[PDB]
Amino acid sequence: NGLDLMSSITFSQQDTNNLSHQEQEYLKEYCDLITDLKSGDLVDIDLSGSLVPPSDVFIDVRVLKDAGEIQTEYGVFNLIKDSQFFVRQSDVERLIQQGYLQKI
Amino acid sequence: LPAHLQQTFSPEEIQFIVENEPIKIFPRITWQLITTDDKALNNMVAMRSTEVVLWIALLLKQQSKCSIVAPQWLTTKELDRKIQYEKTHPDRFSELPWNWLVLARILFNKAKDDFHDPIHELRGKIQDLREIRQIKVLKGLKYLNESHLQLDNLSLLEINELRPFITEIMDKLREIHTASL
Amino acid sequence: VSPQQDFSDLMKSWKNERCSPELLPYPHQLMKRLLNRISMQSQLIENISMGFLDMQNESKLPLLCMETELERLKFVIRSYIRCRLSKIDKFSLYLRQLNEDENSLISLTDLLSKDEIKYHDTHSLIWLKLVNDSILKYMPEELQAINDTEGSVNMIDEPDWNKFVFIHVNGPPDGENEFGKPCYTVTIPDLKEEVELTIGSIYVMRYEVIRDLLRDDKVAL
Amino acid sequence: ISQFSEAYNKILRNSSSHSSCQLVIFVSCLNIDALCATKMLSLLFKKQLVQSQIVPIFGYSELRRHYSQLDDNINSLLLVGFGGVIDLEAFLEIDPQEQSFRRDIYVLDAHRPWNLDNIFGSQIIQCFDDGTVDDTLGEQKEAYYKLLELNDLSKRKQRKKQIHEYEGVLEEYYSQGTTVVNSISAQIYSLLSAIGETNLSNLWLNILGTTSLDIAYAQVYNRLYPLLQDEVKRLTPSSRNSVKTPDTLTLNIQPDYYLFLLRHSSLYDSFYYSNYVNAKLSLWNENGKKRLHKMFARMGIPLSTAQETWLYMDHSIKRELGIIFDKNLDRYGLQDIIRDGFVRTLGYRGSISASEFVEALTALLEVGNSAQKLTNLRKRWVSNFWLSWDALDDRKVELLNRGIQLAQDLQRAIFNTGVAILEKKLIKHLRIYRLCVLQDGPDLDLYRNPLTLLRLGNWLIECCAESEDKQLLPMVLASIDENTDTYLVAGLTPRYPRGTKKPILNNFSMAFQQITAETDAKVRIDNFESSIIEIRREDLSPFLEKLTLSGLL
C-alpha cells in the first residue's frame, strides 16, 4: 500500500474477485488494521516502503509510459512519458511502487 | 512482513551497517550542524585530517568536497604480509578488519583516484585474499558438528553469504541428534 | 544517555532482532526518546529549510547531510518494527498461551509496544474471524480450541531456543565471568561439555545457552 | 551576450530551492551535438546535485505542447539548439511577468543568423550568442536602435526613406542560410573550463561533439584541432605505458580515417561502405568495384584477409597500416583519408575511434528502438532517444555494440538503395539546381528518420560530386511508406572535395518559407530543422514546380 497517499485500496491484486470474498473481507479489514499503525507514527512512515536503504540519496528515474503529471505531493513533478527526473530518494520510494518510475 | 531474506541479512544491509563506522578525511572546505549522532564537527580545516562517520565522507566525496584517506590496512604491500600469514596457517583465518570486503567494494567506486597505486593491484590482491580464504572456509566446513564452530576472524559479508546454509543444515543436523537421546 | 549511544543500542537491537529465532523485549525507554527526537529534527529541518529562502534575494550541504541521515535512521527503526510485527504474526498463538499463563512475564506494556499490542490483538481477532467463517462451520468439537492437543501440536511452536545464531563475543572485561584462558563466558551446554567461549572469535551455537549473555549484551549477534 | 561563468552563477542563484529546483533543460533535438552538450551539462549539475528535468523534444511544433502545458514553479529554464532561427518570445508569449524577470530561459544554439527579436529586447534571454558571432553583426545592431522608436514634410519623407534604408539591409539579414558556426558542446566546455573541471570523459564528450558534424563540413573545425589537441595535452593518464594499464587507459591521438568502421568491421567492407571512398572510386559501378581490389593488390593485403574482422587481422598488417596507406593511397587520389584523430581506449574491451562512436549513436537513433500515427512514431523516436543516451555511459558498453551491429546494417541498407538509384540515373540536373525523388525503394522504415535521410542524402551528394566538374548543386530527396503520403523531403548542402573556400549557406530554409507564404500546399515545417519539411503527393508536384521557380539562388 501503495504508496504516498495510499490513497485508497484499488486496482491492486489482479486476483480481485476470482479470489474468495471471504479472504477479501479479511484483507480489507487487514489494511484497515494497518491504517491504524500508519496513524500511530509519527516517523513519518512510509513504513510500507523503503525496505531497501537510501543511496545516495539522489537517484535518476526514467519515465515508463505514465501520465501524468500526477505528482501533487511535495511538488508537481509533471510526469511526462520519456522524461527522467533527477529527484531525491524521498518521492522516488513513493512513486516507484505505483509503476511510474523505472530505473533507479 | 520483511519477505526477503528474511533470516539472513541482505548484502546491501551489511553496507548499510558498515557505513556507520568512522574513518579519517581530508576536507577541502574551511550551520551547524548538530545532526543527531555525529558529534562532529567544528568547521573542518582544509589540509587537515579529521575523524568522521563513513556515509558522510562518501556523501561529500560525490561532491568531491573532501578527499578520503586510505586505511592503513588497505595497501598492497600491507596485504602481502596478510596472504603470507594466511597461506602459512591453513586453519586460522588471521586478522581481518571484519568489513574488509565491503570497504573494498565501497572505497573503490569513487575514492579510487585518491589511493596511491589503486590500479590493477589491490583489486587483484583482495580478489585473491577473497579466494584462498573462501576455499579455506569450504574445507574448514567439513568439520561441522553440533554444537560448536570456530569461525574465528571472518568478514561480515562472508558470514552473511553462507549463513542460511550453515544455520540451516545445523538445524537439520542438531535436530536429529538432540532428539535421539 | 548520549545520542550516539542510543543509536549504537538501536543498531545492536536491530541486529539482535533479525538474528534471533524469537521475540525480544520491547525497549521503550530508548525507542520512545528517539520517536520524540525525530519528531523534533523533522520539524527543525523543515523550519530551517523554510527560513533559508528569506536570505534569498548558499550551501545546501548540512541540510542534505541532515536529511539523508534522517532517511537512514527513519529506515532503521522501520525495519525493526516491521520485523517484530512479523514475528508477532508467527508467534500470535504462542504469545496467547504465554498470556493466559501466570508465570512468568506476559505481554503487558513491556514485552510488546503500546502500538504493537493493538496490532497483535486485532490481527489475532480478524484471523480467528477469517478461519471461523471459512473452514470452521463445519467445526470439530475437540478442535474448537486453538492450542495443544497435544500433537502435532499446534503452536506452541515456535519458541525455538535451540536454533543456531551467529554470535560475536564483545563486552567490558574487569581485567565478572572471565575464567581463562582468554576470557568469559560459560556456556555449560546441557548435551555437551564447555568449549568454552573466547571473546575475539565468533562462535555459532544454540540461542538458549547464550540467552543470558544476550540479556547482558556480552555477545553481539 | 554575457560571460559564460556569470550566466552560470545566475542559473545558480535562481536554481537551488525546496521543493527545488526547478528547471527543465530541453535537449534538442535529434542532433548528436545535443547529447554531447547536455550530457556534460547534466553531469555538471549532478556535481552540485541540482535537480533537473530533461526533455527529449522532437518536433518544433511539439515544444509548444510542452511549454504551454506544464510549468509551475520553474524560475530558470534551459533550452538547446532551438530559437536561434525562430524566436520563442512571439512563439510562446510572454507576456512579461513581474525588470528582474522571474524566469530565465537560456537558449543554446549553433545556428545562424540569430533571430532579430531574440538578442535585443531582453525578456526570455539571456542569449547564448557569445562568443561566435558577437560580432559585429552591426547589421542587427542598427536594426533596432534606429527602428525603435522612430518643413516637417521633408523630415517625414527623409525619416521614412531612412526607415526603408535600414529595412533593406535588415532584410538582407535574417533571410539567409542556416549554418552552424561552432559546436554548442565546445562552448559548454569553454563555460566548463572557467569553473575548473578538466574531467576526461567530459573532454571525450567534447570530442564527440566536435566530431558529430564532420560528416557535414567542419567548417571552422579544421581549426578546432588546436582547441582540442591542446586540451588533450593539458592532461595525460601516464607519461609512458605501463601496459595497459587496466585503468586510465584513456583517449589518445592516432592516424584515424574517414574510413568507415575500421576497427569494428572487416577491412574490405570498411572501404566498400565508407562514404568518402564510395565517391572517388565509383563503387556503385561494377567496373570501379574492381579498382578497390586493385588497391588491395597494391597493398599486398589478401582478399581473404580483407574479408576478416579487424580485431583478428595479423599484427604485421597492423604495424604497416600507417605505412602501406602512404605508399599506395596517394596514387588513387585518396590521399585525403588520414586525419589526426582522437581515440579512447577502454583497454581489454577494445578501442573506439571518435567518429565510429558517433556512428554507433546515430545508428541507435533510428533503429534498435492521421495525427495519432505520426505522434506515436515521433514518440517511438523519443523513447529511442534514451536508448541512444545510455550508450554514452561508460559503465554500460554491452548495448553500445548493439548500436554498431546496427550501424553496419544501416550502411548495408543505405549503400544498397543508394546504388539502386544510380543504376536508373534518377538525378534531375534541371537548370538552377540538382534535384531527386525516391518514388520507390526497399524498407522505407529506415528512411523515416530525418537523420537517415541526412546520411543517405550525404552519401549521395558526396557520390554525385567528387568533384566532378561542374557547379556543386544542392540535392533534394523524398520517401514515402505509411502515414498517408507524408513524403518527407529534406534540404541538403553541397560538398567540396577538401578544398573549402566558402560556407555556401543552405538556401532551402528560405525557399521553403517563401512557399509556405505563397500557396502553402501541404507544407509542414513541423521538423525542427529549416532544411527539412513534409509534403503530400497531391501537392508535392505543384510544390516542386514552385520550388524550381523562382530560384532564390
PDB file of N, CA and C in Angstrom, chain D residues 244-323:
ATOM      1  N   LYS D 244      48.519  -2.219 -19.518  1.00  0.00           N
ATOM      2  CA  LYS D 244      47.876  -1.321 -20.477  1.00  0.00           C
ATOM      3  C   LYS D 244      47.875   0.168 -20.068  1.00  0.00           C
ATOM      4  N   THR D 245      47.586   0.541 -18.810  1.00  0.00           N
ATOM      5  CA  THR D 245      47.114  -0.294 -17.692  1.00  0.00           C
ATOM      6  C   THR D 245      45.581  -0.398 -17.685  1.00  0.00           C
ATOM      7  N   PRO D 246      45.011  -1.405 -16.990  1.00  0.00           N
ATOM      8  CA  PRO D 246      43.552  -1.611 -16.967  1.00  0.00           C
ATOM      9  C   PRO D 246      42.700  -0.381 -16.644  1.00  0.00           C
ATOM     10  N   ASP D 247      43.270   0.609 -15.957  1.00  0.00           N
ATOM     11  CA  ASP D 247      42.577   1.874 -15.689  1.00  0.00           C
ATOM     12  C   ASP D 247      43.412   3.090 -16.085  1.00  0.00           C
ATOM     13  N   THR D 248      42.768   4.030 -16.780  1.00  0.00           N
ATOM     14  CA  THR D 248      43.417   5.202 -17.376  1.00  0.00           C
ATOM     15  C   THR D 248      44.735   4.866 -18.093  1.00  0.00           C
ATOM     16  N   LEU D 249      44.742   4.185 -19.251  1.00  0.00           N
ATOM     17  CA  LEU D 249      43.604   3.729 -20.078  1.00  0.00           C
ATOM     18  C   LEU D 249      42.623   4.836 -20.459  1.00  0.00           C
ATOM     19  N   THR D 250      43.074   5.725 -21.339  1.00  0.00           N
ATOM     20  CA  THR D 250      42.242   6.818 -21.819  1.00  0.00           C
ATOM     21  C   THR D 250      42.470   7.106 -23.305  1.00  0.00           C
ATOM     22  N   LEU D 251      41.904   8.226 -23.758  1.00  0.00           N
ATOM     23  CA  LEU D 251      41.996   8.681 -25.144  1.00  0.00           C
ATOM     24  C   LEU D 251      43.362   9.225 -25.534  1.00  0.00           C
ATOM     25  N   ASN D 252      43.650   9.121 -26.830  1.00  0.00           N
ATOM     26  CA  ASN D 252      44.956   9.437 -27.390  1.00  0.00           C
ATOM     27  C   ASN D 252      44.835   9.737 -28.886  1.00  0.00           C
ATOM     28  N   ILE D 253      45.866  10.359 -29.461  1.00  0.00           N
ATOM     29  CA  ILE D 253      45.917  10.627 -30.904  1.00  0.00           C
ATOM     30  C   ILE D 253      46.442   9.433 -31.710  1.00  0.00           C
ATOM     31  N   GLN D 254      45.756   9.147 -32.811  1.00  0.00           N
ATOM     32  CA  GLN D 254      46.104   8.055 -33.709  1.00  0.00           C
ATOM     33  C   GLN D 254      45.785   8.524 -35.124  1.00  0.00           C
ATOM     34  N   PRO D 255      46.454   7.954 -36.138  1.00  0.00           N
ATOM     35  CA  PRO D 255      46.105   8.269 -37.531  1.00  0.00           C
ATOM     36  C   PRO D 255      44.750   7.692 -37.948  1.00  0.00           C
ATOM     37  N   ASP D 256      43.667   8.316 -37.499  1.00  0.00           N
ATOM     38  CA  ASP D 256      42.323   7.881 -37.857  1.00  0.00           C
ATOM     39  C   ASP D 256      41.923   8.211 -39.272  1.00  0.00           C
ATOM     40  N   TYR D 257      40.867   7.539 -39.702  1.00  0.00           N
ATOM     41  CA  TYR D 257      40.460   7.508 -41.084  1.00  0.00           C
ATOM     42  C   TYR D 257      39.001   7.873 -41.231  1.00  0.00           C
ATOM     43  N   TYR D 258      38.665   8.676 -42.242  1.00  0.00           N
ATOM     44  CA  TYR D 258      37.255   8.885 -42.571  1.00  0.00           C
ATOM     45  C   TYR D 258      36.683   7.549 -43.009  1.00  0.00           C
ATOM     46  N   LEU D 259      37.565   6.571 -43.186  1.00  0.00           N
ATOM     47  CA  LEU D 259      37.162   5.216 -43.499  1.00  0.00           C
ATOM     48  C   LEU D 259      36.174   4.715 -42.458  1.00  0.00           C
ATOM     49  N   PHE D 260      35.183   3.946 -42.899  1.00  0.00           N
ATOM     50  CA  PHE D 260      34.019   3.627 -42.073  1.00  0.00           C
ATOM     51  C   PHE D 260      34.126   2.343 -41.263  1.00  0.00           C
ATOM     52  N   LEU D 261      34.134   2.494 -39.944  1.00  0.00           N
ATOM     53  CA  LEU D 261      34.120   1.372 -39.010  1.00  0.00           C
ATOM     54  C   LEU D 261      35.348   0.474 -39.092  1.00  0.00           C
ATOM     55  N   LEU D 262      36.532   1.075 -39.170  1.00  0.00           N
ATOM     56  CA  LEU D 262      37.723   0.285 -39.441  1.00  0.00           C
ATOM     57  C   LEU D 262      37.892  -0.743 -38.355  1.00  0.00           C
ATOM     58  N   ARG D 263      37.706  -0.328 -37.114  1.00  0.00           N
ATOM     59  CA  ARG D 263      38.011  -1.211 -36.009  1.00  0.00           C
ATOM     60  C   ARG D 263      36.913  -2.227 -35.697  1.00  0.00           C
ATOM     61  N   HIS D 264      35.651  -1.882 -35.900  1.00  0.00           N
ATOM     62  CA  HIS D 264      34.599  -2.836 -35.559  1.00  0.00           C
ATOM     63  C   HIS D 264      34.027  -3.625 -36.739  1.00  0.00           C
ATOM     64  N   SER D 265      34.586  -3.441 -37.934  1.00  0.00           N
ATOM     65  CA  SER D 265      34.154  -4.219 -39.098  1.00  0.00           C
ATOM     66  C   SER D 265      35.326  -4.743 -39.933  1.00  0.00           C
ATOM     67  N   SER D 266      35.042  -5.681 -40.830  1.00  0.00           N
ATOM     68  CA  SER D 266      36.062  -6.181 -41.743  1.00  0.00           C
ATOM     69  C   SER D 266      36.541  -5.094 -42.708  1.00  0.00           C
ATOM     70  N   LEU D 267      37.853  -5.048 -42.948  1.00  0.00           N
ATOM     71  CA  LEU D 267      38.503  -4.009 -43.755  1.00  0.00           C
ATOM     72  C   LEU D 267      37.897  -3.745 -45.128  1.00  0.00           C
ATOM     73  N   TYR D 268      37.784  -4.780 -45.948  1.00  0.00           N
ATOM     74  CA  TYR D 268      37.166  -4.636 -47.261  1.00  0.00           C
ATOM     75  C   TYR D 268      35.778  -4.016 -47.166  1.00  0.00           C
ATOM     76  N   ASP D 269      34.960  -4.498 -46.236  1.00  0.00           N
ATOM     77  CA  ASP D 269      33.626  -3.932 -46.053  1.00  0.00           C
ATOM     78  C   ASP D 269      33.741  -2.509 -45.512  1.00  0.00           C
ATOM     79  N   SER D 270      34.880  -2.221 -44.901  1.00  0.00           N
ATOM     80  CA  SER D 270      35.135  -0.894 -44.390  1.00  0.00           C
ATOM     81  C   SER D 270      35.491   0.102 -45.492  1.00  0.00           C
ATOM     82  N   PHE D 271      36.158  -0.321 -46.559  1.00  0.00           N
ATOM     83  CA  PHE D 271      36.307   0.582 -47.698  1.00  0.00           C
ATOM     84  C   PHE D 271      34.981   0.657 -48.421  1.00  0.00           C
ATOM     85  N   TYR D 272      34.475  -0.513 -48.787  1.00  0.00           N
ATOM     86  CA  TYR D 272      33.303  -0.643 -49.637  1.00  0.00           C
ATOM     87  C   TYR D 272      32.098   0.130 -49.118  1.00  0.00           C
ATOM     88  N   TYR D 273      31.950   0.260 -47.803  1.00  0.00           N
ATOM     89  CA  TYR D 273      30.847   1.085 -47.308  1.00  0.00           C
ATOM     90  C   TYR D 273      31.230   2.507 -46.926  1.00  0.00           C
ATOM     91  N   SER D 274      32.512   2.841 -46.947  1.00  0.00           N
ATOM     92  CA  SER D 274      32.924   4.157 -46.468  1.00  0.00           C
ATOM     93  C   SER D 274      32.364   5.225 -47.364  1.00  0.00           C
ATOM     94  N   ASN D 275      32.115   6.400 -46.808  1.00  0.00           N
ATOM     95  CA  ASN D 275      31.390   7.404 -47.559  1.00  0.00           C
ATOM     96  C   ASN D 275      32.238   8.230 -48.516  1.00  0.00           C
ATOM     97  N   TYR D 276      33.425   8.620 -48.076  1.00  0.00           N
ATOM     98  CA  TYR D 276      34.305   9.438 -48.905  1.00  0.00           C
ATOM     99  C   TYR D 276      34.836   8.650 -50.099  1.00  0.00           C
ATOM    100  N   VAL D 277      35.066   7.363 -49.870  1.00  0.00           N
ATOM    101  CA  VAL D 277      35.636   6.457 -50.856  1.00  0.00           C
ATOM    102  C   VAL D 277      34.595   5.914 -51.858  1.00  0.00           C
ATOM    103  N   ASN D 278      33.325   5.897 -51.471  1.00  0.00           N
ATOM    104  CA  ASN D 278      32.282   5.473 -52.394  1.00  0.00           C
ATOM    105  C   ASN D 278      32.197   6.441 -53.587  1.00  0.00           C
ATOM    106  N   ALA D 279      32.731   7.650 -53.407  1.00  0.00           N
ATOM    107  CA  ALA D 279      32.743   8.676 -54.430  1.00  0.00           C
ATOM    108  C   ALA D 279      33.904   8.505 -55.377  1.00  0.00           C
ATOM    109  N   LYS D 280      35.103   8.756 -54.864  1.00  0.00           N
ATOM    110  CA  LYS D 280      36.288   8.851 -55.701  1.00  0.00           C
ATOM    111  C   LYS D 280      36.519   7.584 -56.529  1.00  0.00           C
ATOM    112  N   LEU D 281      36.129   6.433 -55.995  1.00  0.00           N
ATOM    113  CA  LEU D 281      36.423   5.179 -56.667  1.00  0.00           C
ATOM    114  C   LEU D 281      35.275   4.601 -57.490  1.00  0.00           C
ATOM    115  N   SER D 282      34.146   5.299 -57.539  1.00  0.00           N
ATOM    116  CA  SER D 282      32.980   4.845 -58.300  1.00  0.00           C
ATOM    117  C   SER D 282      32.521   3.421 -57.953  1.00  0.00           C
ATOM    118  N   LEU D 283      32.251   3.184 -56.669  1.00  0.00           N
ATOM    119  CA  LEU D 283      31.995   1.841 -56.136  1.00  0.00           C
ATOM    120  C   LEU D 283      30.608   1.282 -56.438  1.00  0.00           C
ATOM    121  N   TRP D 284      29.667   2.157 -56.769  1.00  0.00           N
ATOM    122  CA  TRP D 284      28.352   1.722 -57.224  1.00  0.00           C
ATOM    123  C   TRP D 284      28.477   0.983 -58.556  1.00  0.00           C
ATOM    124  N   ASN D 285      29.490   1.368 -59.334  1.00  0.00           N
ATOM    125  CA  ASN D 285      29.824   0.722 -60.602  1.00  0.00           C
ATOM    126  C   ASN D 285      30.562  -0.592 -60.391  1.00  0.00           C
ATOM    127  N   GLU D 286      30.188  -1.616 -61.146  1.00  0.00           N
ATOM    128  CA  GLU D 286      30.903  -2.882 -61.076  1.00  0.00           C
ATOM    129  C   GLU D 286      32.327  -2.729 -61.609  1.00  0.00           C
ATOM    130  N   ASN D 287      32.500  -1.820 -62.566  1.00  0.00           N
ATOM    131  CA  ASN D 287      33.808  -1.570 -63.169  1.00  0.00           C
ATOM    132  C   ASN D 287      34.770  -0.890 -62.201  1.00  0.00           C
ATOM    133  N   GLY D 288      34.215  -0.123 -61.271  1.00  0.00           N
ATOM    134  CA  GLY D 288      35.020   0.549 -60.273  1.00  0.00           C
ATOM    135  C   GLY D 288      35.281  -0.301 -59.044  1.00  0.00           C
ATOM    136  N   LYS D 289      34.357  -1.214 -58.750  1.00  0.00           N
ATOM    137  CA  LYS D 289      34.492  -2.097 -57.597  1.00  0.00           C
ATOM    138  C   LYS D 289      35.832  -2.806 -57.639  1.00  0.00           C
ATOM    139  N   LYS D 290      36.183  -3.255 -58.837  1.00  0.00           N
ATOM    140  CA  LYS D 290      37.457  -3.891 -59.089  1.00  0.00           C
ATOM    141  C   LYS D 290      38.625  -3.004 -58.658  1.00  0.00           C
ATOM    142  N   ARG D 291      38.495  -1.686 -58.841  1.00  0.00           N
ATOM    143  CA  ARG D 291      39.593  -0.750 -58.572  1.00  0.00           C
ATOM    144  C   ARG D 291      39.994  -0.800 -57.100  1.00  0.00           C
ATOM    145  N   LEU D 292      39.021  -1.137 -56.260  1.00  0.00           N
ATOM    146  CA  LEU D 292      39.271  -1.424 -54.859  1.00  0.00           C
ATOM    147  C   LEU D 292      40.207  -2.615 -54.733  1.00  0.00           C
ATOM    148  N   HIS D 293      39.799  -3.743 -55.292  1.00  0.00           N
ATOM    149  CA  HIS D 293      40.654  -4.912 -55.290  1.00  0.00           C
ATOM    150  C   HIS D 293      42.045  -4.599 -55.808  1.00  0.00           C
ATOM    151  N   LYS D 294      42.161  -3.701 -56.783  1.00  0.00           N
ATOM    152  CA  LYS D 294      43.484  -3.296 -57.262  1.00  0.00           C
ATOM    153  C   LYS D 294      44.202  -2.562 -56.156  1.00  0.00           C
ATOM    154  N   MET D 295      43.439  -1.832 -55.344  1.00  0.00           N
ATOM    155  CA  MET D 295      44.045  -1.193 -54.186  1.00  0.00           C
ATOM    156  C   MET D 295      44.640  -2.281 -53.318  1.00  0.00           C
ATOM    157  N   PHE D 296      43.872  -3.335 -53.065  1.00  0.00           N
ATOM    158  CA  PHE D 296      44.363  -4.395 -52.188  1.00  0.00           C
ATOM    159  C   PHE D 296      45.538  -5.169 -52.822  1.00  0.00           C
ATOM    160  N   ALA D 297      45.531  -5.294 -54.141  1.00  0.00           N
ATOM    161  CA  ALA D 297      46.646  -5.900 -54.836  1.00  0.00           C
ATOM    162  C   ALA D 297      47.870  -5.014 -54.655  1.00  0.00           C
ATOM    163  N   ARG D 298      47.649  -3.713 -54.519  1.00  0.00           N
ATOM    164  CA  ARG D 298      48.760  -2.800 -54.310  1.00  0.00           C
ATOM    165  C   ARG D 298      49.269  -2.897 -52.885  1.00  0.00           C
ATOM    166  N   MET D 299      48.367  -3.165 -51.954  1.00  0.00           N
ATOM    167  CA  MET D 299      48.754  -3.222 -50.554  1.00  0.00           C
ATOM    168  C   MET D 299      49.380  -4.566 -50.200  1.00  0.00           C
ATOM    169  N   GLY D 300      49.037  -5.595 -50.964  1.00  0.00           N
ATOM    170  CA  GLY D 300      49.556  -6.922 -50.695  1.00  0.00           C
ATOM    171  C   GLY D 300      48.728  -7.587 -49.620  1.00  0.00           C
ATOM    172  N   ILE D 301      47.651  -6.912 -49.255  1.00  0.00           N
ATOM    173  CA  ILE D 301      46.664  -7.471 -48.361  1.00  0.00           C
ATOM    174  C   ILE D 301      45.798  -8.462 -49.105  1.00  0.00           C
ATOM    175  N   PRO D 302      45.797  -9.715 -48.652  1.00  0.00           N
ATOM    176  CA  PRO D 302      44.947 -10.755 -49.231  1.00  0.00           C
ATOM    177  C   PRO D 302      43.494 -10.323 -49.272  1.00  0.00           C
ATOM    178  N   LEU D 303      42.746 -10.804 -50.251  1.00  0.00           N
ATOM    179  CA  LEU D 303      41.314 -10.566 -50.276  1.00  0.00           C
ATOM    180  C   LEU D 303      40.642 -11.263 -49.087  1.00  0.00           C
ATOM    181  N   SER D 304      41.086 -12.487 -48.816  1.00  0.00           N
ATOM    182  CA  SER D 304      40.568 -13.276 -47.705  1.00  0.00           C
ATOM    183  C   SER D 304      40.848 -12.613 -46.365  1.00  0.00           C
ATOM    184  N   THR D 305      41.979 -11.924 -46.272  1.00  0.00           N
ATOM    185  CA  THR D 305      42.362 -11.208 -45.053  1.00  0.00           C
ATOM    186  C   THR D 305      41.601  -9.876 -44.951  1.00  0.00           C
ATOM    187  N   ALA D 306      41.161  -9.366 -46.088  1.00  0.00           N
ATOM    188  CA  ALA D 306      40.323  -8.185 -46.087  1.00  0.00           C
ATOM    189  C   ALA D 306      38.919  -8.530 -45.621  1.00  0.00           C
ATOM    190  N   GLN D 307      38.468  -9.746 -45.910  1.00  0.00           N
ATOM    191  CA  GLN D 307      37.115 -10.152 -45.509  1.00  0.00           C
ATOM    192  C   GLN D 307      36.952 -10.413 -44.005  1.00  0.00           C
ATOM    193  N   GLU D 308      38.074 -10.634 -43.328  1.00  0.00           N
ATOM    194  CA  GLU D 308      38.083 -10.992 -41.914  1.00  0.00           C
ATOM    195  C   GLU D 308      37.963  -9.780 -41.014  1.00  0.00           C
ATOM    196  N   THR D 309      37.273  -9.956 -39.889  1.00  0.00           N
ATOM    197  CA  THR D 309      37.039  -8.884 -38.920  1.00  0.00           C
ATOM    198  C   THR D 309      38.341  -8.238 -38.448  1.00  0.00           C
ATOM    199  N   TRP D 310      38.297  -6.932 -38.203  1.00  0.00           N
ATOM    200  CA  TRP D 310      39.504  -6.180 -37.919  1.00  0.00           C
ATOM    201  C   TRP D 310      40.204  -6.532 -36.617  1.00  0.00           C
ATOM    202  N   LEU D 311      39.475  -7.030 -35.632  1.00  0.00           N
ATOM    203  CA  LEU D 311      40.139  -7.419 -34.399  1.00  0.00           C
ATOM    204  C   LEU D 311      41.225  -8.448 -34.696  1.00  0.00           C
ATOM    205  N   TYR D 312      40.925  -9.365 -35.611  1.00  0.00           N
ATOM    206  CA  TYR D 312      41.727 -10.579 -35.774  1.00  0.00           C
ATOM    207  C   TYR D 312      42.783 -10.584 -36.871  1.00  0.00           C
ATOM    208  N   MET D 313      42.900  -9.491 -37.615  1.00  0.00           N
ATOM    209  CA  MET D 313      43.878  -9.424 -38.687  1.00  0.00           C
ATOM    210  C   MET D 313      45.274  -9.560 -38.097  1.00  0.00           C
ATOM    211  N   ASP D 314      46.226  -9.985 -38.917  1.00  0.00           N
ATOM    212  CA  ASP D 314      47.581 -10.228 -38.443  1.00  0.00           C
ATOM    213  C   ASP D 314      48.231  -8.961 -37.919  1.00  0.00           C
ATOM    214  N   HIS D 315      49.238  -9.127 -37.070  1.00  0.00           N
ATOM    215  CA  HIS D 315      49.897  -7.990 -36.441  1.00  0.00           C
ATOM    216  C   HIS D 315      50.750  -7.167 -37.408  1.00  0.00           C
ATOM    217  N   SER D 316      51.400  -7.852 -38.342  1.00  0.00           N
ATOM    218  CA  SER D 316      52.240  -7.191 -39.327  1.00  0.00           C
ATOM    219  C   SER D 316      51.441  -6.166 -40.114  1.00  0.00           C
ATOM    220  N   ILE D 317      50.218  -6.528 -40.484  1.00  0.00           N
ATOM    221  CA  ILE D 317      49.359  -5.634 -41.251  1.00  0.00           C
ATOM    222  C   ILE D 317      48.951  -4.436 -40.408  1.00  0.00           C
ATOM    223  N   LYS D 318      48.836  -4.649 -39.106  1.00  0.00           N
ATOM    224  CA  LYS D 318      48.515  -3.555 -38.206  1.00  0.00           C
ATOM    225  C   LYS D 318      49.654  -2.560 -38.125  1.00  0.00           C
ATOM    226  N   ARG D 319      50.869  -3.063 -37.940  1.00  0.00           N
ATOM    227  CA  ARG D 319      52.018  -2.176 -37.819  1.00  0.00           C
ATOM    228  C   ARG D 319      52.281  -1.430 -39.132  1.00  0.00           C
ATOM    229  N   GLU D 320      51.877  -2.041 -40.244  1.00  0.00           N
ATOM    230  CA  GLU D 320      52.033  -1.456 -41.576  1.00  0.00           C
ATOM    231  C   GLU D 320      50.799  -0.690 -42.037  1.00  0.00           C
ATOM    232  N   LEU D 321      49.806  -0.566 -41.163  1.00  0.00           N
ATOM    233  CA  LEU D 321      48.560   0.096 -41.539  1.00  0.00           C
ATOM    234  C   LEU D 321      48.764   1.591 -41.765  1.00  0.00           C
ATOM    235  N   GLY D 322      49.767   2.154 -41.103  1.00  0.00           N
ATOM    236  CA  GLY D 322      50.052   3.573 -41.226  1.00  0.00           C
ATOM    237  C   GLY D 322      51.071   3.887 -42.305  1.00  0.00           C
ATOM    238  N   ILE D 323      51.648   2.842 -42.879  1.00  0.00           N
ATOM    239  CA  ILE D 323      52.676   2.997 -43.899  1.00  0.00           C
ATOM    240  C   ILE D 323      52.093   2.683 -45.263  1.00  0.00           C
TER     241      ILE D 323
END
